[PDB]
Amino acid sequence: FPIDLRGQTAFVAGVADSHGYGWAIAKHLASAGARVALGTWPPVLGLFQKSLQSGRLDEDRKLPDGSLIEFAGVYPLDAAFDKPEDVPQDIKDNKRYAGVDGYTIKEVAVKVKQDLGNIDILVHSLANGPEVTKPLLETSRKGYLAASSNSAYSFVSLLQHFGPIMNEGGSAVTLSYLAAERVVPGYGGGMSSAKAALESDTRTLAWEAGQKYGVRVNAISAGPLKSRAASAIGKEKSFIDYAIDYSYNNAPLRRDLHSDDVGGAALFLLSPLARAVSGVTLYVDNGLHAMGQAVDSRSMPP
Amino acid sequence: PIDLRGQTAFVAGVADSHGYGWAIAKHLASAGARVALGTWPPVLGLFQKSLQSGRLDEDRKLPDGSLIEFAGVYPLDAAFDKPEDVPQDIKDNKRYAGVDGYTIKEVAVKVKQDLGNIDILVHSLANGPEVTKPLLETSRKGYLAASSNSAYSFVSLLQHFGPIMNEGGSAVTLSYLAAERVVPGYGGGMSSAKAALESDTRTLAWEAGQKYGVRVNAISAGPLKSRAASAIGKSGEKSFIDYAIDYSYNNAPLRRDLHSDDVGGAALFLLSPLARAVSGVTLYVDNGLHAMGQAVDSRSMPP
Amino acid sequence: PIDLRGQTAFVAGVADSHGYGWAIAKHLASAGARVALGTWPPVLGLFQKSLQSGRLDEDRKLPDGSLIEFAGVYPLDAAFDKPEDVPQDIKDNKRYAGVDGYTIKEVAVKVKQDLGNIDILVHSLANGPEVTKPLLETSRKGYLAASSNSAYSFVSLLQHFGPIMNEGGSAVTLSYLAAERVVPGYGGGMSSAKAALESDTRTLAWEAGQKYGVRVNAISAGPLKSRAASAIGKSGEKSFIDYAIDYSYNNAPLRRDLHSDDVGGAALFLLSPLARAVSGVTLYVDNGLHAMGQAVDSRSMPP
Amino acid sequence: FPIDLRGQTAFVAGVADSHGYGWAIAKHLASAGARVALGTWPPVLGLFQKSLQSGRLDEDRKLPDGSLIEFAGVYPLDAAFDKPEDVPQDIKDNKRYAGVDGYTIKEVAVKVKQDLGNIDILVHSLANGPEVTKPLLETSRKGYLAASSNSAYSFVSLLQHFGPIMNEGGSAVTLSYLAAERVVPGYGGGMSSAKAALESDTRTLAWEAGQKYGVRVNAISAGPLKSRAASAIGKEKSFIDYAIDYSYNNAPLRRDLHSDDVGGAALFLLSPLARAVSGVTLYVDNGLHAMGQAVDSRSMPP
Ligand SMILES: NC(=O)c1ccc[n+]([C@@H]2O[C@H](COP(=O)([O-])OP(=O)(O)OC[C@H]3O[C@@H](n4cnc5c(N)ncnc54)[C@H](O)[C@@H]3O)[C@@H](O)[C@H]2O)c1
Numbered sequence A, D: 001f002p003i004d005l006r007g008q009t010a011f012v013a014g015v016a017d018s019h020g021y022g023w024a025i026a027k028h029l030a031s032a033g034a035r036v037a038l039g040t041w042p043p044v045l046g047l048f049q050k051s052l053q054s055g056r057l058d059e060d061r062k063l064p065d066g067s068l069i070e071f072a073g074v075y076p077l078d079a080a081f082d083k084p085e086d087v088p089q090d091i092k093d094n095k096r097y098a099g100v101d102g103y104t105i106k107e108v109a110v111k112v113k114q115d116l117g118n119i120d121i122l123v124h125s126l127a128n129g130p131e132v133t134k135p136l137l138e139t140s141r142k143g144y145l146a147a148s149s150n151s152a153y154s155f156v157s158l159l160q161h162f163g164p165i166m167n168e169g170g171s172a173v174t175l176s177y178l179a180a181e182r183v184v185p186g187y188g189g190g191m192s193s194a195k196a197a198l199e200s201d202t203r204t205l206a207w208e209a210g211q212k213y214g215v216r217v218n219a220i221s222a223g224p225l226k227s228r229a230a231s232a233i234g235k236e237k238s239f240i241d242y243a244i245d246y247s248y249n250n251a252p253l254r255r256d257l258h259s260d261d262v263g264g265a266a267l268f269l270l271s272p273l274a275r276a277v278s279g280v281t282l283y284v285d286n287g288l289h290a291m292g293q294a295v296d297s298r299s300m301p302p
Numbered sequence B, C: 001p002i003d004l005r006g007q008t009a010f011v012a013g014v015a016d017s018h019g020y021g022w023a024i025a026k027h028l029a030s031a032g033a034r035v036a037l038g039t040w041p042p043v044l045g046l047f048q049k050s051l052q053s054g055r056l057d058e059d060r061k062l063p064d065g066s067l068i069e070f071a072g073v074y075p076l077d078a079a080f081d082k083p084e085d086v087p088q089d090i091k092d093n094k095r096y097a098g099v100d101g102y103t104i105k106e107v108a109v110k111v112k113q114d115l116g117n118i119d120i121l122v123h124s125l126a127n128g129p130e131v132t133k134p135l136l137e138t139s140r141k142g143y144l145a146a147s148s149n150s151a152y153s154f155v156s157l158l159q160h161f162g163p164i165m166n167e168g169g170s171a172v173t174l175s176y177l178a179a180e181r182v183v184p185g186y187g188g189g190m191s192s193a194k195a196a197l198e199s200d201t202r203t204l205a206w207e208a209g210q211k212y213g214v215r216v217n218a219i220s221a222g223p224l225k226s227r228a229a230s231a232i233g234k235s236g237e238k239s240f241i242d243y244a245i246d247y248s249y250n251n252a253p254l255r256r257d258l259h260s261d262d263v264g265g266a267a268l269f270l271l272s273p274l275a276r277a278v279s280g281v282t283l284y285v286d287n288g289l290h291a292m293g294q295a296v297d298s299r300s301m302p303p
């Protein structure tokens, strides 16, 4: 009864597997009585579906009481496209999309409205920076704009198409990284840039969507977590691995950051306990954000 | 769900049912915490009687239909750390007659004695004698008092409770936006002392996080007509706070009445295992007012 | 005093005498810089004629009674990096007839050719086709355009000028408050793209600071009725910008008319050896509006 | 002519020697045509006076053109006291104060008004944390309150007593440190705390003083500099020495931070070039503020 989402329905954009923050959020949302629908990137939908029906993810679905998480729908969704006229021929051609239709944001909204009705909870757990491993001086207009398009406009588009089907008192969460506010070497490709805009837009949307639909809009700035999208930067030992160590050694709380930690925080920002909370960037990072200085620097002593 | 059974909390700065302290206490209990309270001695008697009568039973009802009961109500003056710090005027002050052992060190001891190690600590108190005065008209004695009562109190409170706090425990305090941007009428260096409070939340989140594995956070709240807010500007007319609430209602993303429960629940989260990777933050619980860079109802502006 | 003799600057985004770009140029020159300009090709002709006629000579007078002369006025489209990026419609666009070599790579080359390594770089341009539209009514094509023209342009500009910039050189860009807090009517994802711009200032201050020992800063400006600001909301009536200026005048610490010189001089500092330990900052040049947490002239509120 | 302060008069609180930021600010202000008066802590006034008349500081006074800096007055000033009734008997007793009167903020304001007239420029370059080397968990009410009183209220009091004698369009600068916003280990004793309040009050004063006198109010957050007050923390190799290294190795600009660097920045914030600038915290720190991560951490590689 302190968090109780029975009755409510949630849509979680960006779940391809059990290793990202999206999975964890969906897991907790569901754990609280909500109906949870996923939006899944089409090229990877096939393998995800397999994973689920094979019983290969039955461990990662175990809710505290042994029950397994049901998903009330798993929708093809490419949040780089707002509507049909936007999808290139080479994508409709592309083998990997071959099989499913109705995967633009406008179309997924429409599918969800009539399959499930109005929703309560909207989760944006997805980014894509083609040139993430390039520093800004080496990132191209096209790679920068793609990172913006995939990782920030995607959120605005989602709100634009889901807010009309969202109940008054609904809530929406997205996910940033500290790079948005402060320099993080290695996080390139205009991703820092895009996250900064994701944060700005979390504020503007909180306003526009607060007034138009009474729907809250918040962000979590989250610490490093070895998701599959995170392992692919530098694709040996790599961006995320060093990120995890740096935070272990320098954060106020010395502990492993678990995907569920963001899961819990998301649950709060999407629950009635947060009815007065909007426009916020909430740090879920063991407190790393609060430091002005490394405590494991070579430039002092151990 | 979130489950605080087995856990004990001390909420400091509870004298009535109208405070953010009350609402927080009411939410820790409804999640199954044991809740002991801290109450400024001058008003302890009138508070004890309010509970004991039954006047607060409306305000005491939890979701399950039962009634919050407290596990001890401690006299507490957060302006004092030790009994040597209490001056003669207060020892022999008529408002403080009957009450004993209310300095921070002593309360922390009796709380250890009577209850054992706590898990949760709330700092929900403030006081600045010259709050009505702008900063250009505020004195060293009163500004320093504002810092003493509203900022340092949180430092001492952590210092003296930290040791009796379980690994993975939480402390949270309460600020107002004025700490980051100017809110007129929020005077007496309360603005100053809330910025200090926020800074200390970060610094202590480090210190207490490294030493005790305790989390430390701050909720920056929006306007609420609590007893203390009513006292600001006091005549008997539409006060500082009335205008704050009106302004927020008219300029916040969410057009809404902020209720003490709204913070109750925001805090509940912060003091719960759901927040175990959250520390050192300033969580705006203000209907989104903080995010605005411009009032919408300005007279420069059309409706 | 501060002395820019021997130094050369390229100020990008100058088509009239009403812009913040103009005022900055006018201040670099009055400190004895050589100032070459960047001008969007569609308006280059009308700009060249304005200077050449003598219509701007009022706007051209420096403190010493003389007249700013420019060391070359380059056609520049910051939406394009290379001549392969320019599409056929623009190649054969009537507004672009006569002008050649205006992509960022090419301008940086001719600037190297004609003048050598520069010391100072100003980014004073923005464009977002759907600026009148709130974000909930903004398109991917237009939001992306806003980022392309107003944010990435600064990245490319540094990328392509960095190499021809002297150790200890400066670049500065221009933002608006909306990047941090909501300013209604500032739409089309201009808000979004200014936040990106500010973030990149920090990231590039690192990157360019480590590689070139170049500084990189951002002035967050207050409202000014420049040509581009007048175009926002355009009917023929009291516009978005008129209300911005009124609001600021009524709610800023300093009750004052913000003039383009106010930024001219703030920037001058940032691009001068006085600022050699300053990099990655967002300097509010806004009569102190940014510091406020509440409008004073709200209709919730009494005069 | 780009900065030209001839005619104007400045008062610089907190100059005891040629090694602090106060000296540098005063040096540049004077360098620009201003009359510059100093407020100097009484216990150290004697030695300072000596230093100046002995010709021992004639190097540090050399302005670019070889001319030497004149000071239009050097006032006893203990900014822990607002007015005569506030000074304890043991301080009036104290040998070190024995010799000079009129050293409270109210009295120095009054002395300056009639010796020099109305002023234009006010500089607050002073702090004192009795327990700076103690972390916050170990700092006492008294030490915390003293750090607040010395380093933050001091500024409010100065504005309170100088603003009445300040010309419209005047300007005022104080000096913070990054500890105010983000955790810096070693900077204890409630100094972080006080600086946070110094920043808050720079904003509130910009408002109160903007409206009441048309006087601007700004802060510089400055990087580490081996002033004499800075050498006394840890009083061997110590807080400031490590601070200087950490910033050398981790800041966007890899260069020595010189007292003049803050001097220049101060000059700007106190000049007509800043007439639209108020309420600001201006970072003069080689860009250290902008980083979210050390680049010399043990937790990666070199
Ligand atoms: N893992 C971390 O350390 C970390 C830290 C901070 C923030 N984040 C953020 O959290 C979010 C999820 O990241 P994660 O680590 O859980 O990654 P993840 O491995 O869950 O996958 C990212 C997801 O986005 C999807 N995606 C990419 N392009 C898409 C498109 N065009 N349309 C629809 N979906 C697309 C993929 O299906 C994938 O599920 C990301 O936005 C990221 O910015 C992650």
Ligand SMILES: NC(=O)c1ccc[n+]([C@@H]2O[C@H](COP(=O)([O-])OP(=O)(O)OC[C@H]3O[C@@H](n4cnc5c(N)ncnc54)[C@H](O)[C@@H]3O)[C@@H](O)[C@H]2O)c1
Pocket: B013, B014, B015, B016, B018, B019, B020, B021, B022, B039, B040, B043, B076, B077, B078, B079, B123, B124, B125, B126, B127, B149, B174, B175, B176, B220, B221, B222, B223, B224, B225, B226, B227, B228, B229
């Ligand atoms: N009410 C609001 O609008 C609002 C907004 C933002 C922040 N806050 C903050 O929340 C906290 C709770 O206050 P509130 O608004 O709920 O009203 P309240 O009436 O509950 O708060 C005042 C309480 O603090 C206690 N107290 C005051 N001075 C004390 C002292 N010297 N020693 C010990 N206890 C003392 C009193 O007993 C009283 O119970 C305050 O710290 C305040 O800064 C309140």
Ligand SMILES: NC(=O)c1ccc[n+]([C@@H]2O[C@H](COP(=O)([O-])OP(=O)(O)OC[C@H]3O[C@@H](n4cnc5c(N)ncnc54)[C@H](O)[C@@H]3O)[C@@H](O)[C@H]2O)c1
Pocket: C013, C014, C015, C016, C018, C019, C020, C021, C022, C039, C040, C043, C076, C077, C078, C079, C123, C124, C125, C126, C127, C149, C174, C175, C176, C220, C221, C222, C223, C224, C225, C226, C227, C228, C229
């Ligand atoms: N005027 C204000 O109130 C205000 C406030 C805050 C920030 N700013 C910023 O300051 C900068 C200068 O603009 P301004 O207000 O001085 O007016 P302006 O009319 O001088 O700015 C527009 C200029 O940028 C150029 N430009 C526009 N799109 C371009 C493109 N795609 N490629 C190359 N050049 C292009 C134009 O030639 C034009 O000269 C802008 O970046 C803006 O974001 C202005």
Ligand SMILES: NC(=O)c1ccc[n+]([C@@H]2O[C@H](COP(=O)([O-])OP(=O)(O)OC[C@H]3O[C@@H](n4cnc5c(N)ncnc54)[C@H](O)[C@@H]3O)[C@@H](O)[C@H]2O)c1
Pocket: D014, D015, D016, D017, D019, D020, D021, D022, D023, D040, D041, D044, D077, D078, D079, D080, D124, D125, D126, D127, D128, D150, D175, D176, D177, D221, D222, D223, D224, D225, D226, D227, D228, D229, D230
């Ligand atoms: N040096 C640094 O690295 C550094 C970094 C950031 C900020 N600062 C700040 O700059 C300011 C000056 O510091 P600095 O390094 O130049 O120190 P400094 O060596 O110049 O001396 C501090 C000054 O404050 C004075 N003082 C102390 N208590 C006083 C009192 N009660 N009344 C009047 N004066 C008093 C002393 O006379 C001394 O001149 C300080 O406020 C400090 O917070 C210094």
Ligand SMILES: Oc1cc(Cl)ccc1Oc1ccc(Cl)cc1Cl
Pocket: A126, A127, A128, A129, A130, A132, A176, A177, A191, A223, A224, A225, A229, A230, A233, A240, A243
């Ligand atoms: O934003 C992130 C930050 C971190 Cl530390 C780790 C992973 C993140 O997520 C991504 C990073 C790059 C790409 Cl291409 C895609 C994704 Cl989902």
Ligand SMILES: Oc1cc(Cl)ccc1Oc1ccc(Cl)cc1Cl
Pocket: B125, B126, B127, B128, B129, B131, B175, B176, B190, B222, B223, B224, B228, B229, B232, B241, B244
């Ligand atoms: O901090 C606050 C902010 C607001 Cl808007 C309203 C009340 C607040 O709380 C206080 C303000 C002044 C005093 Cl003397 C005591 C308290 Cl508890």
Ligand SMILES: Oc1cc(Cl)ccc1Oc1ccc(Cl)cc1Cl
Pocket: C125, C126, C127, C128, C129, C131, C175, C176, C190, C222, C223, C224, C228, C229, C232, C241, C244
């Ligand atoms: O950024 C700005 C902020 C303000 Cl208040 C006023 C003008 C601004 O500048 C622009 C805004 C929109 C477009 Cl299309 C182009 C430009 Cl140059």
Ligand SMILES: Oc1cc(Cl)ccc1Oc1ccc(Cl)cc1Cl
Pocket: D126, D127, D128, D129, D130, D132, D176, D177, D191, D223, D224, D225, D229, D230, D233, D240, D243
């Ligand atoms: O604030 C400061 C920050 C830094 Cl890095 C260095 C020196 C500073 O200045 C002081 C620090 C402590 C005390 Cl007791 C007095 C002063 Cl003037």
